[PDB]
Design a protein around this ligand. Structure first.
Ligand SMILES: CNC(=O)c1cc(Oc2ccc3oc(Nc4ccc(Cl)c(OC[C@@H]5CCCN5C)c4)nc3c2)ccn1
Length: 283
């Protein structure tokens, strides 16, 4: 990270071209003038210690290194040179974190649509839910391909933009932690797959909190290690629940890879669409 370079000619943005807004270590909303090729709303992560400055600077280098992907919040620029505080600028996703958003659509859900469709205008459907899952998996496939390990994958770190496009971000969580992470402090791509399994449960429970009614203590961890798992959420399909179980396999090397998840979820998305075309056609 630190060894990574920072190409200022390409990424540097003038501090006076920004107008800081309300709060979203701190992430805040702001208006950028000329960030691309005009005033555009952006999100800014800045410090609120040399240690912390190095961390943020390294996050910036890594995002640059990783590159662009539709399902990863896009980096737009940064203010790193002397004269002001260090600021990392990204795209702004208007609908916000997926957990809160799904929570707000609980009275606006139908498994699929049929005529008259306006009965379900802006409703969420199985297609939406599988689609959000498919998107995040592609994003993680992209990051794991580059040896990146998120370490905090959860609904709260997924953002929703225009046209139902979701993006993986990091505002920086025992309930999202793999057994090896809790007990051996081991973080790997495979522990990220475990977390993804919890993310799936969050999406298919429409933003509910994981392990409902369970106290997170010594017994929680013990039983997790021994094989106990959350039960199927209210809006899941049998296949999506099995995928969740596949993601929570006790043996890290037996969990599916993100490439396998992208392939699998894509297949479920297509089967769901075909089913939907028949429901729509017959009624
Ligand atoms: C309503 N809309 C909003 O509220 C809203 C809030 C927003 O907030 C932000 C602001 C700046 C950000 O910068 C990052 N970094 C970041 C993103 C992805 C990865 Cl994989 C990463 O990786 C971090 C590093 C690299 C791999 C493992 N990690 C430890 C770091 N996420 C951010 C989120 C953005 C858009 N809308």
């Amino acid at each position: 990270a630190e060894r990574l370079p920072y190409d200022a000619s390409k990424w540097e943005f003038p501090r006076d071209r920004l107008k800081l807004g309300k709060p979203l270590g701190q992430v805040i909303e702001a208006d950028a003038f000329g960030i691309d090729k005009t005033c555009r709303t952006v999100a800014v992560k800045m410090l609120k210690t040399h240690s912390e400055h190095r961390a943020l600077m390294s996050e910036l280098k890594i995002l640059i290194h990783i590159g662009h992907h539709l399902n990863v919040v896009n980096l737009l620029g940064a203010c790193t040179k002397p004269g002001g505080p260090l600021m990392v600028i990204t795209e702004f996703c208007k609908f916000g974190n997926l957990s809160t958003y799904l929570r707000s659509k609980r009275n606006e859900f139908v498994p699929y649509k049929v005529a008259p469709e306006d009965l379900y205008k802006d409703f969420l459907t199985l297609e939406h839910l599988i689609c959000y899952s498919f998107q995040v998996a592609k994003g993680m496939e992209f990051l794991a391909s580059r040896k990146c390990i998120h370490r905090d994958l959860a609904a709260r770190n997924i953002l929703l933009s225009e046209k139902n496009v979701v993006k993986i971000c990091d505002f920086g969580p025992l309930k999202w932690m793999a057994p090896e992470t809790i007990f051996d402090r081991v973080y790997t791509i495979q522990s990220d797959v475990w977390s993804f399994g919890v993310l799936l449960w969050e999406i298919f429970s429409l933003g509910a909190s994981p392990y409902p009614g369970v106290k997170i203590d010594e017994e929680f961890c013990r039983r997790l290690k021994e094989g106990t798992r959350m039960r199927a959420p209210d809006y899941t399909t049998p296949e999506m629940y099995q995928t969740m179980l596949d993601c929570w396999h006790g043996e890290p090397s037996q969990r599916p890879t993100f490439s396998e998840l992208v392939e699998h979820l894509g297949n479920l998305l297509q089967a769901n669409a075909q089913q939907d075309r028949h429901h729509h056609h017959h009624h």
